[PDB]
Every structure is written in structure tokens, then in C-alpha cells.
Design a protein around this ligand. Structure first.
Ligand SMILES: CCC1=C(C)/C(=C/C2=NC(=C\c3[nH]c(/C=C4\NC(=O)[C@H](C)[C@H]4CC)c(C)c3CCC(=O)O)/C(CCC(=O)O)=C2C)NC1=O
Ligand SMILES: CCC1=C(C)/C(=C/C2=NC(=C\c3[nH]c(/C=C4\NC(=O)[C@H](C)[C@H]4CC)c(C)c3CCC(=O)O)/C(CCC(=O)O)=C2C)NC1=O
Ligand SMILES: CCC1=C(C)/C(=C/C2=NC(=C\c3[nH]c(/C=C4\NC(=O)[C@H](C)[C@H]4CC)c(C)c3CCC(=O)O)/C(CCC(=O)O)=C2C)NC1=O
Ligand SMILES: CCC1=C(C)/C(=C/C2=NC(=C\c3[nH]c(/C=C4\NC(=O)[C@H](C)[C@H]4CC)c(C)c3CCC(=O)O)/C(CCC(=O)O)=C2C)NC1=O
Ligand SMILES: CCC1=C(C)/C(=C/C2=NC(=C\c3[nH]c(/C=C4\NC(=O)[C@H](C)[C@H]4CC)c(C)c3CCC(=O)O)/C(CCC(=O)O)=C2C)NC1=O
Ligand SMILES: CCC1=C(C)/C(=C/C2=NC(=C\c3[nH]c(/C=C4\NC(=O)[C@H](C)[C@H]4CC)c(C)c3CCC(=O)O)/C(CCC(=O)O)=C2C)NC1=O
Ligand SMILES: CCC1=C(C)/C(=C/C2=NC(=C\c3[nH]c(/C=C4\NC(=O)[C@H](C)[C@H]4CC)c(C)c3CCC(=O)O)/C(CCC(=O)O)=C2C)NC1=O
Ligand SMILES: CCC1=C(C)/C(=C/C2=NC(=C\c3[nH]c(/C=C4\NC(=O)[C@H](C)[C@H]4CC)c(C)c3CCC(=O)O)/C(CCC(=O)O)=C2C)NC1=O
Lengths: 49, 96, 58, 162, 160, 160, 162, 160, 162, 162, 162, 160
């Protein structure tokens, strides 16, 4: 219990801060069958990028 | 600025170094926009990050030095220019 | 001239990739003329083999 | 972005603490308001075009100088971009209301927005007027309990712009 | 959390949340009290869970606490137990969150590099979190035990 | 459906489904009988829903069935009612699916180009959808009409 | 990709027909199997590394020549590619089992896999025996009831290769 | 304008303007007096054109100016005539520029979004622009009539 | 692509020859039709939406089961793709009419279209009937000479489909 | 890409044996020829522009119809393509000679080149004649001992394109 | 990048001067230490994982708050990034030692490092302490003669960050 | 090999080899005879190197051959010694090639995933490779010992 104690107090670093992350949802068009809504999503993502 | 926008839109990135600027400036001065686009898209970096099927996305690369901060400033930056050259808007009130 | 229809297989030799990349390994696409030399040379330098080359238009 | 739950998780993680009675109180408070938030988000999403219509009509009625020749809302392109920005504000306010927290606003809307508008020539006072108008339009449809919560995020957008 | 996942998915597509997403959020907030009591129960019994899980870990794996083992000695054993305590805390966070996102992003991303730098065997992590699973699902009722065991299984798979 | 969305989300990251996704699918399958009863109620009374909704639509906008209107005549009014029937079927599909993907894929993607090439006013469609929403939610209880309203509102917003 | 529910929806859509007793019965069957499917998916996801270890060990004990020099699995790269493919098959079989259809297996796995192995030189029969080993290991794990449900999609993959 | 189009096309290729582009510019600037004559004629007849076009629009669609119409009342009818004036000004700008680019990017891009937000029916705009076409092409000579008609056709098609 | 002028240039360049009397005669013939082609192209551009609406209405009135459930044009997605294809055919016929050459059709529309439609299940006969309906509407709008010129490329499209 | 050293290494790796006397003899042979190969590669690098100069000159003197109107090498563009291909053949033949193996010709020259030439209609006979011209020019400059070695890889390219 | 040889070359090239006796003396001084630099670089490459492990251990022992909850190195995410940064520092210090110049450190490590860490919240003094930890751990392994050479580049990094 | 890497690098810029790469190949082929002598001395020393390295490994890490260990048992110890034999052959290949490319391609790409699937402790790999380095370096002269130790250090770094 002693070895897990926070030493910077409430003025510590949460996980949210630090380095910036890329968008977690990765858009791709799979070879083969593709749903229409997912295709529209990918196309909108490409135009947005 | 066009080079920086190219890297932003198709590599999700800021320009890595001055060598990238020199290469793409030489391409833009000689051949135009299409050849610069094909240079960005035929790059090894593009095929290693997005391959053939992944939409390019915002990245914040750890290396080289200064590229992470530049990429943060780049991917954060929204469009700053008016969308048309016709009919500019002006600051000024009409009082009722 | 005009378009090519190129089929090539690009294996992976530098790493073992965790995504699926079946489509990045085997792929048939249309490559129009003024880019085909560069694309063929990149496929060759990636270690991939070109399976077929066809002239669709021209 | 972070919601109320992840905000409590942050507060207790930076301290290396398990959840206390106050943490469970805050989590109860968020869970209690969940159905209200879901209903309000459904209502807003149902009437987004309507809300934007009243908000834009009020803004351009109070300030006809935006849509006169030489205003920042004068062209079909710039009128469309204005109502598009109002769509942005409404949708992200709905996101923040569902999250119970204003982090998504700061990260996705307000970050660099003031300088972006200044470079575009977009009037920020008029944008705050449009956001406020959208607040009164939305509050009537969502209801008093939902309106009080939704006005928090609308006022957050207005203060961030100011 | 569940709300964050739904909002991020709706934002990456630049749309309002779908009726199904609102339905999953409704179900999540409707079940908040039960998962909240689950986190309460696991939090009250931190010391017993950590002590028993450490005992089963060291009995199943004597080499960890034997001379030359990574957890050999009192202080390294305490570091072992407080890592287990970290992960129990993350499991409570995930239970209240409704997803394994807190666990994923506090104690999973970069866990391999962290434990490689520390000469900590990842298998040892796996049976440690399995023992903590056994102890922690012992104290809970069947449905609560299954719900908690899903998070512990996710952690064990992440360390594996 | 819900399961398809969860699987596609997991596959995009090349991972197995997390406990949150599994819990979402569990809540979906647990609620299957309720939405099935709702869909059966909607389909068993579909003729009444279509006739009444057409009645409110024509009352609100008599110009549609007036001379110079798009729905003037027996065959054109029949086409209008048949479109209403199409969208009622799509709403039942969405109910059983748990999300609006069937509606989005059969009746929304490219609907503006369709109704533009057909000279059909979109606000007329929006208010016809609103009329179907009112009539259909009339048949169901408050709880069932609650979720059915979200699907109908999605359809109205998509047309608008 | 397609689910059982989406499959029924598409069948009744191409007919332009509303749901009837048969469609409702099929949907009820899927809803009844849903909790079993979720339990099996969770059990498999928890033990994916163990299933792959046991199945690959069984395959390389039955066919040791694959990992000695000259075998298609002889190098660290090629062995890693082999166990990686086993991971693919297990994960996508789990996806299919949750879905209740094999559409994902056709679209995202078997689409051009045979000729890819042919050009690479991967022994298709040995890969099929590896899939069979995964089927046995997974059936020993999830239980008797879910074993046949999993083996349906494992056999679909095996027949797709062969 | 024509010159701007040629220059941006040359600039996208990092080159000087080719003899074809210079010939195009030469032909454009040789016809400037005709374009200015046409624009001046359309400017003189501005009030007549707007008056007759509005009258033709309203006599076909009495509901627009009746109680409950979009343009009902003196102020809303004035806004109607003001929009017609906007588009006539844009056509004169297009004639002097030699292209529909001023028309396009002052009053075509986002026009459907704008009129949808205003609840102004697009068919009314298309019919009004056709009326303006007829009235304006009546005033000009045939060779100028064809040129003005091209710009009005572009506007009417873009609104449709 | 190549137009009539570029076709003549290509012929005399491969022959290695300067322009002859017959080449100049072909160039005179093409230049003499320039104003007629420009007027026809402007008329078609001004009326393209009307042509597409009338032709699609004719095609779907003659074959109602194309857009009823089970038809290839049954969904808003399918109907949209159908009318978009009709717009493509009209626009490319107009381009080919302006160029005085059918090449642009070959290398930009017809290449692979038969295979694409056979793989998708698009009925070739109904597509040909839609093209002929556009031909009739366009010929009614453009006048006799312009219709004679446009019919060449409409027939070329229909024949290249089959 | 594999050289002689890598060829021996892979040959022994697929068998799982260590280097024997035969392997060491092959390695000694390659090491002995290494200095000559480096000198030859340097000489060829020095004269590459001149080699392509003279080889293309002889090829177009022997087949004047190649560069005259109607020929495959008739334009500035196609002539540039011809001399570019000749450059690439020379450089890759130098790579292969320096490596001591003909693999690089397989994966980086003949990898799809014959199909490309067949699709474009490039005359294989004239290409072989041009390669022989490069062979003749290179052998005159490099020296007989290394000219014989370059002949192997030039003949490999000629046979592969054939 | 610049090394000692390239630094001398650039110094004489900015003056348009041929090399003089001082330049040749400097080049001799570099070639004399080349073997020691190579041996030290190989020694670092052999022990890089070890050096990083003990250095990070000692750093987190002297500053426990870094890895306790709320610390900047507290999450597997942030801990892994921390030890990754120390690996970067070791690798680039080895580069600078091998090149004999600190130019690589300036233009690939220190350029924008301070305000990068400032934007991140990384404690720069703790990074300096970790770099000192790596220096102390490395000096024992390399040996005093190599220890001084490696220490000048470690001190360059520490002074640039400080 | 040295030649392979130089040729790939030259082909990267689509150019002939520069004096640097040519002199590099020259210096490589000039030293081939002593590389072959070293590879021999490693080759005929088969059992001494392998058995001594395995003995020292099991002495320093008794857990591997102790009950419950990865290498416990006669067949598993045979597999351990066989892996060591594999890597010694790879080191001789890398010696003759002049780089680590044979070692890398045959035994380094994916080795981590391989030994994870085999539940083999990578620190055991590293200790065994250090044992092999000590034994193989003992049999060679100092100049050759340093070079061979470089390849063994590369292998240890790849495993660690
Ligand atoms: C080769 C030159 C170079 C360096 C050095 C460099 C460092 C660097 N460190 C970063 C984040 C970071 N860096 C650290 C470093 C640690 N924080 C602890 O308190 C320690 C005091 C300290 C190291 C001893 C941490 C904790 C993060 C945050 C990582 C995260 O948020 O996940 C980032 C942001 C991007 C990323 O991590 O992927 C960079 C670019 N980048 C470069 O191009
Ligand atoms: C989701 C976060 C986000 C925001 C907030 C955002 C705002 C934004 N508005 C923009 C343009 C614009 N925004 C407006 C809106 C203004 N004009 C009127 O006067 C009003 C006072 C006011 C709206 C109520 C207008 C007219 C433009 C067009 C500017 C131009 O084209 O010159 C632009 C430049 C690019 C573009 O969209 O056309 C941005 C980035 N973008 C984002 O990604
Ligand atoms: C998600 C759908 C999917 C599948 C199924 C898939 C399989 C697949 N396996 C590959 C290679 C491979 N696959 C294997 C596996 C074989 N070796 C043994 O003999 C076994 C019998 C058998 C496995 C049980 C091996 C050894 C390779 C390496 C081939 C080479 O590089 O020479 C490759 C080429 C790319 C690479 O080397 O990483 C693919 C695309 N990829 C996909 O995206
Ligand atoms: C919240 C996410 C998080 C985790 C999990 C975490 C773990 C962590 N464990 C550490 C030490 C340790 N961790 C262990 C645990 C191992 N001993 C046995 O081998 C077992 C296999 C295993 C325990 C089940 C041990 C023995 C040490 C001491 C290592 C040493 O001092 O040399 C350290 C080094 C810093 C310090 O001791 O303060 C960290 C950062 N840090 C984090 O920020
Ligand atoms: C230069 C580009 C440009 C255009 C074209 C433009 C049109 C425009 N018309 C408007 C109102 C209006 N526009 C109309 C016209 C319609 N009423 C009938 O339905 C007819 C079909 C049709 C006229 C032919 C009417 C009636 C209003 C008043 C609506 C109201 O006050 O409720 C408004 C709202 C602000 C205002 O009242 O002035 C704009 C911005 N604005 C621009 O910046
Ligand atoms: C399931 C997806 C789907 C839909 C929705 C769909 C609609 C659709 N409605 C059509 C006709 C029609 N649809 C309507 C309905 C309109 N009349 C009024 O204005 C109302 C606002 C509105 C109905 C509420 C009318 C009047 C027609 C006849 C138009 C004509 O004869 O040209 C047609 C042309 C062929 C036919 O008669 O069936 C289609 C394709 N098709 C599809 O595959
Ligand atoms: C590095 C390996 C490699 C090579 C060599 C290669 C050659 C190659 N030659 C091409 C065309 C060509 N190649 C030639 C040259 C031939 N015709 C002449 O008469 C000669 C007989 C002969 C040369 C000695 C010509 C004239 C063309 C133009 C064909 C055309 O445009 O129709 C093309 C089509 C794309 C383009 O021209 O940009 C390729 C890819 N590709 C490769 O990946
Ligand atoms: C040429 C590149 C290459 C390598 C290196 C390679 C290693 C390798 N070792 C294996 C087995 C094994 N390898 C070991 C060795 C470990 N035991 C102890 O932990 C030691 C620390 C360590 C040896 C130094 C053991 C014990 C097994 C048996 C695993 C089992 O039966 O479960 C296997 C599985 C198939 C088999 O039984 O042979 C492979 C693929 N394969 C390759 O194609």
C-alpha cells in the first residue's frame, strides 16, 4: 500500500494529458463485399481528410 | 505553404525537414501540383502508413525532432483563407 | 498510351504485420501509362512479383 | 474527450485512490441524469434542421447587416457556411450534454477557433448571438430540466468564443 | 466509457448519435447501480483480494519469489502486490465505466515495453491476474462475478 | 444491425470484441422479443397505418392531390401510399435490426436524387413520415412508441 | 458483411414483403442463441493465445517437417506468419459465430486467399489441418453446446481453402 | 473570368500560358465591347425585367403571394424581387467576365442549403429565373439573346 | 482522347506526311459543323435534367418491374445509380458529339462496362432502352440535324453495350 | 536480392547444414573475382552515357525504321523511353555482374517487363539487338576477362525478354 | 549532418580554400581516434538495453514521484515513452560519439526538444537526471578512455536541455 | 551481404555505385579468406561450442531444466540445444556474408512472436547467446574474436 501512493497529490498528470493521439477509428475499404453505409462513411472520411 | 498542406492532407503530418521542402519546392517550380501530389502519394511513407486501402489520417510522429510539435500545430490548424476571391466581407456595423 | 490492368503480389519481408493486409499483398488495379514505369519499379523494389500486365485501353 | 465518469476516474487516478463515497455520489448523480440526457439528445437530433432554421432567422433578423451585400453572411456560399457552423455548434453541444462534460467542446470546437474566425473575417459577436439564439430555440423543445443543462454547454461555447 | 465510445464514433462520422447508440447509453445508465455496487464490493475488499491473489500467485509460481526471481525479497514482492493493486483499481474503474477503456489506456498500452524494461515475466502477469480473478469473483454473486470476470479476462489477454 | 456494427468496429482495430461490445450485443439479443412484438404489431396493422397516414398527409397538404399536384389522380395517390408502405416496412426492419441501417441502405442513400428525378417535394415526404410516426405510435404502448419514434424521426431527418 | 437478422431483412426486402411467421421464427432463433454466442465469443477472446498455442503445437507435432529446414514454416518470419494466420482464422471465425453468417468469411478472409497461398507457396492442406486443430482446441474450451456452432464456421473456412 | 481561368490552369502546371490560352484571351478581349454593350442594356432594363419577371412568376403561382405563401406580404414580395435583382446583377457580372464563375461563386454554391434554410421552394426560383430569361432575352438582339440565354440557362439548371 | 482534328493529325503523323488535300477537306468538313455542334451541346446542357427525367420516366413506365422490389433498380441507392448512369451516357454523348469522334466513349465509358454490368446483374437490354429513350428526347429538343449528329453516338453507346 | 554469397547461404539454409568444402570453395571463387568485378563496375559506371550513346546509335543504324515515322521508337517521347530502357538495362546488368548472381535481373528487370512489352507491342527482336549492342560496346571498354562476365548477364536479359 | 571530416570540409569550403596543414592535422587527429570510437560504439550497441534498464531504474529510484500515480511517467503508455526517449538519447549520443561532432545532437535531438517537452508536460530537469543516469551507467561499461568521449556528448545533451 | 546492401542502396537512388560502395565491396572481398577461416573454426567446433554454452546456460539458469521449466525433459533440452545450433549456423552465415542480413532474415524477423507462441523466455535466449559468444570468442584470435562477438552481440540485442 505504501508503494502505490501518489506523491504529486491532486496536482498530478491524468492519462488524458501527454502526447496527442491519432483518431482511433481507422477508415478502410475492404477488398470484397462492402456495406453501403460503411462505404458512404469511408467516402465521407476521405473527403473530410 | 502548399507543401505543408500536402503533407497535412496526405501524410497527416507536418513537413519533416528542410530537405522535404527543398524537394517539393523543386517539384512545384518545375512540374506543378500533379507531380507533387504523385510524389507524396507514391512515397514509401504513404505505403507504409496507409498502404492501398486505408484513408490517410492525422498523425503526430515522435521522430524526427520538431516533427511532433509541428504536426500538432498543423493538424490543429483549421482553414484560415476565404473560400472565394469574389465579394470580400468587411468589418463594420450598420446602426438601427 | 493509356491504362494498364496490373496484377501483382507483394510479400512481406521486413516484419510480420498484425492487421489483415490480404488486399495489400494480392491486388489488381488499373495503372495508367505515365505512372506505370514508376509503379512497376516500386513493386519490383518492394520484393513483389508482377503476375500479369494487360493493356485495357489504347 | 472525457465524460463525467472518466472525469471522476481521472480525479481518483491522479491520486492513486479507489472510489470513495463522494466518487460514488458523483457517479450516482451522473447515472440519475442519463435518461434525461438521452431523451434530450434524441429530441435535439430530431429537430436539428428546425432549430437551425429558427436560430438563423433570429440572427439575421436582429442583424440584417450580415446578409446585406458586403456582410460576412452575404453569398449563397457564405450563408451556407454560416448555417454549417451553427450545425457544428448544435451537434457538439449535444455531444457535450451527453458526455456531461465540456472537454469535447474545448478540444474539437474552441481550439484555435477565435484566431480562425479572426483570419476568416467572421464576426465573433454575431456568432455568439447565433449561439445564444440557438440556445433559446433549443431550450423550448428540450424542456426546462433539459434546457438548464443544455444552456450550460451553449454558454460554454459563447464564453469560449468571447 | 460507453458514452465516450458512442460520442467518439458519432463524431468521427460527423453525425448525431443513432437511435441504437442512444439505446446502448440508456441501457448503460439503467444498469449503473448494479455495476456501482459491484465496484463498491470490490473496493471494500481490496486488502483481502490482494493478499489472497498474491498467495495463490506465489504458490503456483514459487520461482518468482525464489532467489533469482523477479519478485524475490520483501520490497520486490511488495512491488508485485502493488502492481496487482493497481490492476484491481483499474478493474473497478472499468466496471463503473462500462468498458475496458480505463484498463486499456492506463495499464495496457505500452505494458509490454514497461515490463520488458523491468525484467517482469508477462506470463507471471497472466497467472497473477487470473488469481486475482479467482479471488475477486469469489466474493461476488454469479452475474456480478461473470461481469467482473470479463474484465479480468480482457486484462489477462492484454498481458498475454 | 447492432451485431454487424460491433463486429466491423472490432475488425477495424484487428481485435476481438471487448466486454463493452459483448454487453451491447447481449442487451440487444435480450431485447429481441420486445422489438419482435413491436414489429409484429406494426405489420399486422399496416393497412390502417398507411390509410390513416395518407389521410393526415393529404389534409395537411391538399395541394399534393390538387390539380397541378404531384399526387393528383388515382395512380399517383396509389404511388404515394405505396411509398408510405415502403417506409413502414423499412421502419419494421429497423426495429428488428436494432438500428437504422436497413432504412439507411434501402430508403435513404440516394433518396434526394430519386425524388428529384421524380418531381416529389421533400417536405411532403417529411410530413408524410411525421404522419406515419403519429399513427404508428398511436397503436403501440408508450414504451414501444418511444423507440419507434426515434426510427421515424431518423427517417424524417434523413429525408429533410 | 451480413448477419442473420440482416440476411432475413434482405430476403424479405428483395420480395418487397413484410415479416411473417417464418421470419419472426428465424429472428427468435437467433435471439435465443445470442447469449450462447456471446459467452462463446468471450471465452474464445480470453483464451485466443492459448488456443493458438495448443493448435499450432498439435499441427507442428503432426507435421514436424513444416518447421525443420525446407518446411514452409521454417524461419522466425515464416513461423510468425503461420501463427499470425492462425490468429486470423480464429478471430474471423469468432466474428462469424457472433454474426450467425459466413459472409464475413467470404468477404474478408477467403477473398483471394487460395491464389495468394498458391503464389506464396503455402501448403493449403497443412493450413486446413491447422484450422482443424483450432477447431478441436476451441471445442474443448467453449463447451459441447457452442462447439458445433464454432465448428460450422471452422469447417466453412476449411472448405473455402480446399 | 477567362483570364483568371487561363492563369490558374497555367499556374497549376508551373508554366507560362500556351499559345492556345493566349489565343483564347485574345478572342475574349476582342469581344469586350459587345459584352459591355449587352451588360449595359441589361442594366438599363433592370427594373422592367424584374417587374415583368415577378409578375409572370406570381400570376402562375398565386399561392406564394396569398395568405400562407412564402412571399406573402409587401416585405416578402420585396425580398422576392430583390433576389431576382441579385441574380440579374450576377448575370451582368458573368457577361462582363466571360464566364459564369461570378454567378457560380456568389449565388450558386450553397444556394440549395440557403433556400432550404429559408423554406423558399426551389421550383419557384427556377420558374422565376425562366421568366427573367424570357423578359431579358426579349430586350436584346438575337445574337446577344443567345449569349444572355446561356447564362440564364446555367442559372436555371444550377438552381434545379 | 482524340477529336476529328487529332484523328487526322495522328493519321498523317504515323504516315509521316504533311497535310494533303483530303486532310484539309476533312478539316473543312469538321470546322463547318462547329457552330451546329456548339448549339446542340449548349441546348443539351441547358436541358440535361429534363432529358434524364423524361427518359427515365419512359424507361420505367415501359418496364415497371425494374424499380419494383426484386428489380435491379429497386432501392433509392439503385435508382440513383441508374439515373446517374443515364446522366453519364448523355454527357459523354455530348462530349463525343462536340469532338466529332467516338473515342472518348470507348476509353472512358464503354471499356469494361459490359463486364461490369454482367458482374453486377445490370440488364443490358433495359440500359439500351434507356439510352434510346434519351436519344428520342434529345432529338426532340435539339432539332433534326443535331439529332442526326447525336444519334451516331447514342447508337455507338448502345452497340458498345452489346 | 541475393548475390553469390547469399545464394550459397540460402542453399545451405534450406538444407539446414553448415558450410562444407564445396561452399567454402564457391565463397573463395567469388572473393577472388570480387576485385575484377569492382574494377569492371567502375569502368562501366564511368562510360555509361557513352555506352548508351553508341549502342543506341548502332541499333538505330541497323534498324532505321525504328526511329522513322511509324516506328516503335518514333517520337521524342518514345525515343526517350527507348534510351531510358537501355540505361536501366545497362545499370542492372552492372548490378548483376557486381553481385555475381542473376537474381536482381529476375526481380528488378524481368519482373513483368515481357508482359509490358507485349502489351505495348515493343519489338522483342529489336530489344535483343539493342542489348547485344550494349554488350558489344561494354566488352570493348571493360576488358575481355570482365567482358565475358558481363556477357552472361546481358545474355540473361536477352533470353528473359525473348 | 556534420562529422569532424565534414566540419573541416565545410570550414575550408566556406573560404574557398584547399586543405592546409592544420586541416590535415585535424583529420589525422580524427583518424587516430576512429578505432576507439568504433569500439565504444559497438560496446554501447551491445549493452544498450542494459544501460537503459539500470539508468531508468536509478532515475525512478531517486525520483519515485515520476512513476507513482499522477507522475509524468505513470502509465504503461508514459513509462514506455520515457524509456523510449532514453533509448533515443543513448542512440544519438552514440551517433555523435562515432561522428566526433555534436552537430547531430543539435539538429536531431535538441532542436525544439525543450518546447516539445513543455507542451507535453515532461519535466526537463528529470530528463536531465535520466541522461546523467545513462552517462553514469555507460562510463563503467565502456572504460575511462571511452567514458570521457561518451561523457562529452552526454554532457552536451544535458547542457542543451538544462 | 555487403554487396547486396550496397547494390540495394545504389538502386534506391537509381544510380551506379559511388566510390564509397565500390571501396566497401573491395575491402569486403579482400578480407574474405579470413572470414572463411573464422567460419571454419566455428564450423568444426560444433559440439564444444553448443554443449558448453548449454551447460553454462543451465548452470546459470537452473529453472529452465528444473521441473516445470521450458527446457525440462530430454526432448525439450534437445530442442533448446537445437535452437542454439540454429543460431550458431546463422552466425557463421553472417560472418561469411559480412553483415547480419542472413541472421536477421532467417532468425530475427518475428523471433519474438515465435518464442511467445512457444512460451520460451527471451532472457533465456539472451543468456544462451552470451554463453555462445563467450565460448566461440575463446576459440578465436583477438581480431577475429572481436568481429564474431559483434555478431553475437547483434543477436543478443535482437533477442533483448
Ligand atoms: C531524438 C529526439 C526526440 C526526442 C527526445 C523526442 C521525445 C518525445 N517525447 C514525447 C512524449 C513523452 N515523453 C516522455 C518522457 C519522460 N517523461 C518522464 O517524466 C521522463 C522525465 C521523461 C524521460 C526520461 C513522456 C512521459 C511522454 C508522454 C507519452 C504519452 O503521453 O503517452 C514526444 C511526443 C510524441 C510521442 O511520444 O509519440 C516526443 C516527440 N522526440 C524526438 O524527435
Ligand atoms: C467543429 C469545429 C469547427 C468550427 C467551429 C469551424 C468553423 C469554420 N468556419 C469556416 C468558414 C465560415 N464560417 C462562417 C459563419 C459566420 N458567418 C456569419 O456571419 C455568422 C456570424 C457566422 C456563423 C453563425 C462563414 C460565413 C464562413 C465562410 C468564410 C469564407 O468563406 O470566407 C471555416 C473555414 C473553412 C470552411 O468551413 O469553409 C471554419 C474552419 N470549423 C470546424 O471544423
Ligand atoms: C484475414 C485474412 C488473411 C489471411 C488468411 C492472410 C494469410 C497470409 N499469409 C501470408 C504469408 C504466410 N503464411 C504462412 C502460413 C503457412 N505456413 C505453414 O505452412 C502453415 C501450413 C500455414 C499457416 C497455418 C507463411 C509461412 C507465410 C509466409 C510466406 C513467405 O513469406 O514466404 C500472407 C502474405 C503477407 C505476409 O507475408 O505477411 C497472407 C496475406 N492474410 C490475411 O489478410
Ligand atoms: C497503472 C499501470 C502501471 C503498472 C502496472 C506499473 C507497474 C511497475 N512495476 C514496477 C516495479 C515491479 N513490478 C514487479 C511485479 C512482478 N514481479 C513478479 O515478477 C510478477 C510477474 C510481477 C507481479 C505480478 C516487481 C517485482 C517490481 C520491482 C522491480 C525492481 O525493483 O527491480 C515499476 C517500476 C517503478 C517503481 O517500482 O516504482 C512499474 C512502473 N506501473 C504503472 O504506471
Ligand atoms: C447574392 C446571393 C444571395 C441571394 C440570392 C440571397 C437570397 C436571400 N433571400 C432571402 C429572403 C427571401 N427570399 C425570398 C424569395 C422567394 N420567395 C418565393 O418563394 C420565390 C420562389 C422566391 C423569389 C423568386 C423571400 C420571400 C424571402 C423572405 C423570407 C422571409 O422573410 O420569411 C434571404 C434572407 C435574408 C433577407 O431577408 O434578405 C437571403 C439571404 N442572398 C444572397 O447573399
Ligand atoms: C424502398 C425504397 C424506394 C422508394 C421510397 C421508392 C419510391 C418511388 N416512387 C415512385 C413513384 C411516385 N411516388 C410518389 C409519392 C409522392 N407523391 C407525393 O408528392 C408524396 C410527397 C410523396 C409520397 C408520400 C408519386 C406521386 C409517384 C408517381 C410519380 C410519377 O408518376 O412520375 C417511383 C418511380 C417508379 C414507381 O412508380 O414505383 C419510385 C422508385 N422506390 C424505392 O426503391
Ligand atoms: C527497370 C526495368 C523496367 C524496364 C526496362 C521497363 C521498360 C518500359 N518501357 C515502356 C515503354 C517503351 N519502351 C520502349 C523501348 C523499346 N522500343 C524501342 O523500339 C526499343 C526496341 C526498345 C528499347 C531498346 C518504347 C519505344 C516505349 C514506348 C511505347 C509506347 O508508348 O507505346 C514502359 C511503359 C511505361 C513508360 O513508358 O513510362 C515500361 C514500364 N520497365 C521496367 O520496370
Ligand atoms: C532458424 C530459425 C528458427 C529457430 C531459432 C527456431 C526455434 C524453434 N524452437 C522450437 C521448439 C523449442 N525451443 C526450445 C528452446 C528454449 N528452451 C529454453 O527455454 C531455452 C532458453 C531455449 C533454448 C536456448 C524449446 C524448449 C522448445 C520446445 C517447446 C515445446 O515443446 O513446447 C520451435 C517449434 C517447433 C519445434 O519443436 O522445433 C521453433 C520454431 N525455428 C526456426 O525456424
Amino acid at each position: 500500500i505504501q508503494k502505490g501512493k501518489a506523491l504529486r497529490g491532486a496536482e498530478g498528470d491524468p492519462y488524458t494529458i501527454g502526447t496527442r493521439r491519432s483518431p482511433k477509428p481507422i477508415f478502410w475499404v475492404p477488398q470484397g463485399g462492402t456495406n453501403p453505409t460503411e462505404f458512404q462513411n469511408v467516402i465521407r472520411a476521405a473527403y473530410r481528410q | 505553404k502548399v507543401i505543408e498542406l500536402l503533407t497535412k492532407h496526405f501524410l497527416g503530418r507536418a513537413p519533416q525537414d528542410q530537405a522535404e521542402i527543398q524537394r517539393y519546392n523543386r517539384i512545384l517550380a518545375g512540374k506543378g501540383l500533379k507531380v507533387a501530389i504523385e510524389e507524396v502519394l507514391n512515397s514509401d511513407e504513404y505505403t507504409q502508413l496507409f498502404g492501398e486501402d486505408v484513408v490517410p489520417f492525422k498523425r503526430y510522429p515522435t521522430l524526427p525532432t520538431g516533427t511532433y510539435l509541428a504536426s500538432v500545430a498543423t493538424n490543429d490548424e483549421m482553414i484560415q483563407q476565404s473560400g472565394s476571391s469574389y465579394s470580400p466581407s468587411y468589418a463594420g456595423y450598420s446602426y438601427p | 498510351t493509356r491504362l494498364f490492368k496490373v496484377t501483382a503480389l507483394i510479400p512481406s519481408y521486413k516484419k510480420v504485420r498484425g492487421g489483415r493486409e490480404l488486399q495489400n499483398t494480392y491486388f489488381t488495379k488499373l495503372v495508367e501509362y505515365d505512372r506505370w514505369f514508376a509503379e512497376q519499379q516500386r513493386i519490383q523494389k518492394q520484393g513483389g512479383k508482377i503476375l500479369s500486365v494487360k493493356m485495357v485501353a489504347g | 474527450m472525457q465524460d463525467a465518469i472518466t472525469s471522476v476516474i481521472n480525479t481518483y487516478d491522479v491520486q492513486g485512490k479507489y472510489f470513495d463515497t463522494s466518487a460514488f455520489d458523483k457517479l450516482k448523480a451522473y447515472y440519475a441524469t442519463g435518461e434525461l440526457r438521452v431523451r434530450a439528445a434524441g429530441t435535439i437530433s430530431a429537430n436539428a434542421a428546425t432549430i437551425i432554421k429558427e436560430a438563423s432567422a433570429k440572427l439575421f433578423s436582429n442583424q440584417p447587416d450580415l446578409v446585406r451585400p458586403g456582410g460576412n453572411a452575404y453569398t449563397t456560399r457564405r450563408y451556407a457556411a454560416c448555417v454549417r457552423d451553427m450545425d457544428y455548434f448544435l451537434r457538439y453541444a449535444t455531444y457535450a450534454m451527453l458526455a456531461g462534460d465540456t472537454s469535447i467542446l474545448d478540444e474539437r470546437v474552441l481550439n484555435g477557433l477565435k484566431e480562425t474566425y479572426n483570419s476568416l473575417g467572421v464576426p465573433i459577436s454575431s456568432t455568439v448571438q447565433g449561439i445564444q439564439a440557438m440556445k433559446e430555440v433549443t431550450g423550448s423543445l428540450v424542456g426546462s430540466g433539459a434546457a438548464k443543462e443544455m444552456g450550460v454547454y451553449f454558454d460554454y461555447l459563447s464564453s469560449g468564443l468571447s | 466509457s460507453v458514452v465516450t465510445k458512442a460520442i467518439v464514433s458519432a463524431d468521427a462520422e460527423a453525425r448525431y448519435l443513432s437511435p441504437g447508440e442512444l439505446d446502448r447509453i440508456r441501457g448503460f445508465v439503467s444498469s449503473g447501480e448494479r455495476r456501482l455496487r459491484v465496484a463498491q464490493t470490490l473496493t471494500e475488499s481490496r486488502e483481502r483480494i490482494i493478499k489472497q491473489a498474491g498467495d495463490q500467485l506465489f504458490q503456483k509460481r514459487p520461482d518468482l519469489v525464489s532467489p533469482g526471481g523477479n519478485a524475490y525479497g520483501a520490497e520486490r514482492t511488495a512491488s508485485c502486490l502493488r502492481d496487482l493493486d493497481y490492476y484491481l483499481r483499474l478493474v473497478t474503474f472499468g466496471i463503473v465505466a462500462g468498458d475496458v477503456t480505463p484498463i486499456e489506456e492506463i495499464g495496457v498500452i505500452g505494458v509490454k515495453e514497461m515490463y520488458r524494461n523491468l525484467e517482469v515475466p508477462l506470463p507471471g502477469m497472466v497467472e497473477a491476474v487470473k488469481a486475482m480473478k479467482s479471488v475477486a469473483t469469489g466474493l461476488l454473486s454469479g452475474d456480478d462475478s461473470a461481469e467482473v470476470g470479463y474484465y479480468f479476462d480482457y486484462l489477462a489477454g492484454a498481458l498475454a
